[PDB]
Design a protein around this ligand. Structure first.
Ligand SMILES: O=C1N[C@]2(C[C@@H](c3ccccc3)C2)C(=O)N1c1cncc2ccccc12
Ligand SMILES: O=C1N[C@]2(C[C@@H](c3ccccc3)C2)C(=O)N1c1cncc2ccccc12
Lengths: 304, 304
């Protein structure tokens, strides 16, 4: 029993973290096979950050200007290209520690583990969610750039996120591993609107199921509701609208607890309208939306 | 910026996790050099759990009754002994992946990372605290037994915790790596009183410092207080008494924020007396006590 914000074990990703230096700028890179991936803003100086011309900046750079270090070992760079907002440095040596891996573009409301790194050395691991407005609420300092987000399915690592930017508002923006930003963000030091973040309704409901499984049941009420009636309340409280897809993926948790999805929706409605009244659910005084139904089932079934 | 419940990277510990089978019972073991450590209750059957005689049970066991598997590879057991509540199985092969490590008995209120394992394979990593009543509020299912807690200082792993028991109340009890229980617990399937848990006051104050550093300042008030006056309020609200040692270790955070410890104590007092009023601090509606002053400084300075 018990329920924790649990990260994937980070071993397979630690063996891929390197340091990339271009002039004075150092940040983290990801070494898979004979390619190192990193944020392209590694080629920027103090002078460039308001509006860098990345093509023009890259053109003044050669293979030997990119210093790639894995622990003590220096790597030899034999090719470089820019794909959207990432640099791909071809090195002469395949990473011996390369795990089975894919690159995935995740959807808003999905979760992943972040290995926070500095100078190509791992500092910490935590779990987080792509917010509906495509930001992440991470823990990143100067030099964390190029730190990666991932999921693990058995032996296969799915890299989904590369950290690029802290926004003036203190939240975090980055790319998939093909260098496309999540959300409207660009790699320029400007004020950029993230926009209105909503709560991930399907995730709150998954967490209510997690609570019931672990013995917190006080919020279960006598009521039910409809998908329409519920969504009218969701909208008022800046909750993502709930669809039949959401109801469908909550099926396993519905089956395990014997609580219909719409009965759980009716409990949520009363929590939104009446608050928690100073009570707690799974040691929290607010509604948690950073567990997917998958995460709850995994943690409640012990997938390894 | 941002502030997360961050775990240590788990790579160095993943390479040490093995499966130990004795008869029908399987749980996790820790393979360091040519010794495997695991909970001694691996030698118990359905018949034994109310009051096992571990000496008598062990005496009916030989080296070849202990099946130790690291992934596919079977290990050969060439010696066995019982040290308090752990079994030490000597195997013929030194773990090639053994990191630099120590065994440490941590103190209540200290934090560590848990690698939750099943059948000797790692499932997840999270951060948690030794509660003042020597329990931990983990996330453990059947077969998680022998999962370990640790800290990392540079390249050195300090193993502090081995998981043995879920208590009838849903909280978790285990040993140091010399097999001594934290708290009054025994490895018998009986109702065992954990007793009154308090809040770790020094940790709440560290987290208030973390909040101020990250821009949440609303709880800063015009007041100050005394260590005596504060402790009178602490006692009322089941908070650990604050000592000059606590005040001393908060010095670096005091220096970074320019807020005196006793001014922060006066803010805490008003939060305890008046509650949060529906407001939040670092995305939480309750006072968090699972960050040490060390953890806050580490996360706010980027130790790698
Ligand atoms: O270290 C940098 N540098 C940039 C500034 C930004 C940038 C954009 C265009 C051209 C050059 C640089 C990339 C940044 O946003 N961070 C941080 C990342 N995460 C967390 C941070 C926390 C504090 C300060 C900077 C951070
Ligand atoms: O799998 C076991 N087995 C014991 C029962 C307990 C025991 C004590 C004496 C002799 C034999 C066995 C050790 C346990 O407490 N757990 C669990 C651990 N963590 C989390 C658990 C969650 C659900 C069920 C059991 C759990």
């Amino acid at each position: 029993s018990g329920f924790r914000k649990m990260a994937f074990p980070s071993g397979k990703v630690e063996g891929c973290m390197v340091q990339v230096t271009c002039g004075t700028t150092t940040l983290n890179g990801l070494w898979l096979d004979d390619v190192v991936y990193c944020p392209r803003h590694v080629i920027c100086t103090s002078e460039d950050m308001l509006n860098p011309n990345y093509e023009d900046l890259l053109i003044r750079k050669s293979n030997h200007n990119f210093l790639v270090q894995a622990g003590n070992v220096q790597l030899r760079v034999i090719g470089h290209s820019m794909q959207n907002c990432v640099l791909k440095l071809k090195v002469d040596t395949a990473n011996p520690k390369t795990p089975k891996y894919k690159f995935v573009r995740i959807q808003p409301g999905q979760t992943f583990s972040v290995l926070a790194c500095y100078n190509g050395s791992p500092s910490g691991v935590y779990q987080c969610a792509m917010r509906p407005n495509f930001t992440i609420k991470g823990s990143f300092l100067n030099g964390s750039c190029g730190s990666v987000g991932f999921n693990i399915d058995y032996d296969c690592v799915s890299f989904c996120y590369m950290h690029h930017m802290e926004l003036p508002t203190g939240v975090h923006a980055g790319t998939d591993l093909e260098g496309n930003f999540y959300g409207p963000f660009v790699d320029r030091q400007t004020a950029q609107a993230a926009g209105t973040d909503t709560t991930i309704t399907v995730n709150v409901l998954a967490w209510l199921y997690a609570a019931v499984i672990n013995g917190d049941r006080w919020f279960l009420n006598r009521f039910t509701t409809t998908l329409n009636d519920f969504n009218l309340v969701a909208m008022k409280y800046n909750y993502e609208p709930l669809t039949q897809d959401h109801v469908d993926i909550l099926g396993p948790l519905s089956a395990q607890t014997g609580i219909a999805v719409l009965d759980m929706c009716a409990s949520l409605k009363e929590l939104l309208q009446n608050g928690m009244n100073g009570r707690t659910i799974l040691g929290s005084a607010l509604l948690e939306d950073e567990f997917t139904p998958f995460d709850v089932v995994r943690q409640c079934s012990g997938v390894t």
